[PDB]
Design a protein around this ligand. Sequence first.
Ligand SMILES: CC(C)CCC[C@@H](C)[C@H]1CC[C@H]2[C@@H]3CC=C4C[C@@H](O)CC[C@]4(C)[C@H]3CC[C@]12C
Ligand SMILES: CC(C)CCC[C@@H](C)[C@H]1CC[C@H]2[C@@H]3CC=C4C[C@@H](O)CC[C@]4(C)[C@H]3CC[C@]12C
Ligand SMILES: CC(C)CCC[C@@H](C)[C@H]1CC[C@H]2[C@@H]3CC=C4C[C@@H](O)CC[C@]4(C)[C@H]3CC[C@]12C
Ligand SMILES: CC(C)CCC[C@@H](C)[C@H]1CC[C@H]2[C@@H]3CC=C4C[C@@H](O)CC[C@]4(C)[C@H]3CC[C@]12C
Ligand SMILES: CC(C)CCC[C@@H](C)[C@H]1CC[C@H]2[C@@H]3CC=C4C[C@@H](O)CC[C@]4(C)[C@H]3CC[C@]12C
Ligand SMILES: [Ca+2]
Ligand SMILES: [Ca+2]
Lengths: 163, 107, 59, 48, 96, 145, 145, 132
Amino acid sequence: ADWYGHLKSVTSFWAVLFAFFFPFFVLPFINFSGAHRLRRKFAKFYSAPYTRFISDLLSHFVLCVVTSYFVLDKLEDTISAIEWILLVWFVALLLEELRQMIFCDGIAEYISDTWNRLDLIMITLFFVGFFTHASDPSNQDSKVVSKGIHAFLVVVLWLRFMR
Amino acid sequence: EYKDRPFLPAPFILLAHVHMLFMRLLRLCGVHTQEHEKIQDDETKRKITTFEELNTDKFLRRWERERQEMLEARVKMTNDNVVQAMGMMDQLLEHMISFRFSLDQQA
Amino acid sequence: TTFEELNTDKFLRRWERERQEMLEARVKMTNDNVVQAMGMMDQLLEHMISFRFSLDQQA
Amino acid sequence: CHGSDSHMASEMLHSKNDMFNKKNAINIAYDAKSLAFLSHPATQSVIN
Amino acid sequence: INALVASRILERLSTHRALQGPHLAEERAKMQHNAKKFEELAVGVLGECHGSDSHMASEMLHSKNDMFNKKNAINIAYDAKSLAFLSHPATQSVIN
Amino acid sequence: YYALSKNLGPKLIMMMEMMKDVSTFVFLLLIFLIGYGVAAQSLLSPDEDFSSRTFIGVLFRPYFQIYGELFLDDLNSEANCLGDTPFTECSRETVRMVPFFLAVYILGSNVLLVNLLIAMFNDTYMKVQEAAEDLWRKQNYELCA
Amino acid sequence: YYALSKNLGPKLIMMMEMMKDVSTFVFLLLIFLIGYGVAAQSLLSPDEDFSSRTFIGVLFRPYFQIYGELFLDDLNSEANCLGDTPFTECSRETVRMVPFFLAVYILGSNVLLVNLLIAMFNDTYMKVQEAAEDLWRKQNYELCA
Amino acid sequence: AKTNITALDELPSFALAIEELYKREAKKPHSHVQRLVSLSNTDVLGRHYRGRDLANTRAYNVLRMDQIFARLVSKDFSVNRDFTIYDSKYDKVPGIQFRRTAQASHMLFLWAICLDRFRMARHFWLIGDQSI
Ligand SMILES: CC(C)CCC[C@@H](C)[C@H]1CC[C@H]2[C@@H]3CC=C4C[C@@H](O)CC[C@]4(C)[C@H]3CC[C@]12C
Ligand SMILES: CC(C)CCC[C@@H](C)[C@H]1CC[C@H]2[C@@H]3CC=C4C[C@@H](O)CC[C@]4(C)[C@H]3CC[C@]12C
Ligand SMILES: CC(C)CCC[C@@H](C)[C@H]1CC[C@H]2[C@@H]3CC=C4C[C@@H](O)CC[C@]4(C)[C@H]3CC[C@]12C
Ligand SMILES: CC(C)CCC[C@@H](C)[C@H]1CC[C@H]2[C@@H]3CC=C4C[C@@H](O)CC[C@]4(C)[C@H]3CC[C@]12C
Ligand SMILES: CC(C)CCC[C@@H](C)[C@H]1CC[C@H]2[C@@H]3CC=C4C[C@@H](O)CC[C@]4(C)[C@H]3CC[C@]12C
Ligand SMILES: [Ca+2]
Ligand SMILES: [Ca+2]
């Protein structure tokens, strides 16, 4: 009941996913618990833990798919647009990990969890690989070594999606 | 874990981070905004308290009966009861000897 | 109809005996019986005190 | 019933009763979703 | 031997054509019950014999009896299909 | 038509019950297959444009390597390693990590996941055998009707 | 002559008991083998007259692919696909469905049916072990006589 | 009171007695019988059609209750009643007293299942026939 928040308990994974993907077309015609109604239903639906998990899953799934595309496709002679997007994404992930470090019951409690360990390994692997490519972008050897470190990055990312 | 986490998904979580930093800076240094919450009424609190005490009494009554309906408990009581039955009879014999003497000295 | 009614009665008789032959039921009856035995004796003592008094006032 | 006379018991299970829309005991048992009744050997012998 | 034969006669009669019939069912159950009881007796005495004197017990199991067509107790036990008797350690020791 | 048999009918209901464990196994392997497949395909061909062939390379070998068909001769030919030892004297030093990744992967898929399915199947069988038999006895009437 | 041994004799009776589970497995696989075999043989050779070779093609590979010998190199040669990727640049686009059908088939045969037999074998063993031991003790007298 | 429905006027006296047992039990607070009859959305004779005065004064009749129990068994369960046997002209038929007993027993049985009183349910089940 806490998981689903202010929403009916009969909602399935596909129903919440469809409502998340199509906000204006499935939400009004549903039962829960104008500006002050549409606004009330949004403010209630997106504050639900389940909705934030679903958003985190999809986000991590797109991260896995794009990073997978990035490591399979050849690296350009300069830093590409998808590389910049991934750079912004992994800084954001690093800041989220730091926020989790500060707002917890100690560094030991945070580092005890295996998924947090996987998060550090994936941030560490990406930047090693990125800086390896970004040090000499036209060098063929740098691109080969960068893809070699990023193979390990994709393995840890798909392992972390089991969370 | 997912209750306290910001809603915005990961690529866009930077907006949430800068928003939390802005609120922390505005609260610590600026001291302009604050926190608002809702407090449960005393009526609903006493209702919860009354419900919990009743159900506590109900579980203790059900628990006591159920433990008295076990096979071991029944054998143990039966055992104590037969011992108490002897003791009573033993008192009864003590009385009958006293009677015997009353008639004996009566003859 | 006659066959079904008879067999219904036969199952109820077999069912009643079988439930009375269980260990729990036997312990429970035995338990009630010892309690009833005390009650009877208790009535018996009540009588013996009444006798004691009859001889007591008889002396 | 199956202990006393198996053939007559089969005749009772095959009997159509007028009170319940002219349907036998197995049809009502299936309609009542009585899995225990349907898995019984007497019932299985009639079905076979 | 008599307990084993008794067990076989009651078990085979209980499934015989003269006791076959839709109404001839309760009777049948009682026989099987009596049959197993007799089987239990045959095993039990055998066990007692092996407990008291193992060698003499082996001598009794090897003894040919004239009343039953000059055949020992294991042959009648096999003929009576008494699986419980044949799987007993005393019987297995004689067979070995 | 197998459902009328006493030996096969329950086993077909039992098969429909195991399908959930098979689906559970598919969801758990999918993680290791896509991770190893993207990593291995990228390591083998680090200077190729993405195409449909890249996607076929990510799902083709990894899936069939979990059934014991290990394409090590084919992987050796694709890696451009000319040595007598299978992964030696290669053009790029990164492609020599291809057998290790594989070494981890089949440890994850064959030693861990396959044996875990055997354990689920045994547990599932013991749990739903009597219910499958009962359901077959209800379906016996259904088929007769 | 193995029946006199205490270790092997019961196991031979146990083997004769499992034969029914083996037969059950054969009847369930037969469905997937003939379905996949007719479909795969027809997809590989869609313009050939029926002969005895067509029938041998329907039963030969499908049966031996359930033991891990996957004839993917042979299937690639037979499909007339010239690409570096195994099933690409083919003459007909329909023959590229051959690895998928296979992908479903070995999921049906190796992951589902083989593990189900392991479960039956374990269940059957636990059920008939004491009876097999008793039957061996009766056969001990039979062999002595 | 007299009713315009011809099915209702055919009903015997005992049917009205069960109707009284349903009414008397139903007037008690938080009774599940009232909720069951109200949420069904059916008319007085139990047909699924959803004037008002008969439908409310005699809302716990035996025919409607038979229809409610019929819907609770399955979608095509339909209990057949024959009250024509209670007329005095069918007294000479052999065994009639058992048949009259059996149906009467059946309707109180159903009433005893509805009020979840197991002991009278077991008793009326034993009195009647078609036990299984
Ligand atoms: C915790 C785990 C994930 C750590 C993994 C470490 C990885 C990213 C590092 C550790 C050692 C590294 C290798 C060390 C040396 C060489 C030789 C060079 O000519 C090509 C790159 C290559 C082959 C490196 C690739 C990346 C590498 C494999
Ligand atoms: C953390 C766990 C997974 C263990 C990680 C072990 C990794 C880092 C090791 C295991 C085997 C190693 C490889 C073995 C041999 C060679 C050839 C050498 O000329 C360059 C490095 C290279 C290519 C190594 C790179 C690092 C390597 C892949
Ligand atoms: C019981 C098991 C786990 C034993 C462990 C076996 C491991 C350590 C073995 C098995 C296969 C091996 C690999 C086989 C071939 C190569 C290519 C070579 O150029 C570098 C070393 C490397 C990459 C080996 C690394 C170590 C390796 C992964
Ligand atoms: C319903 C279940 C079994 C899933 C069905 C998936 C089927 C319809 C899919 C899965 C893989 C697909 C094939 C994958 C790739 C190609 C190559 C393309 O150039 C023509 C279509 C073709 C040959 C596809 C045909 C349809 C196909 C066989
Ligand atoms: C965990 C398991 C189930 C993962 C699923 C793997 C599936 C989706 C993979 C494994 C092998 C794959 C096939 C391998 C090769 C080809 C030939 C190509 O020309 C079209 C796609 C096609 C036909 C692939 C379709 C997808 C496929 C069937
Ligand atoms: Ca984390
Ligand atoms: Ca009766």
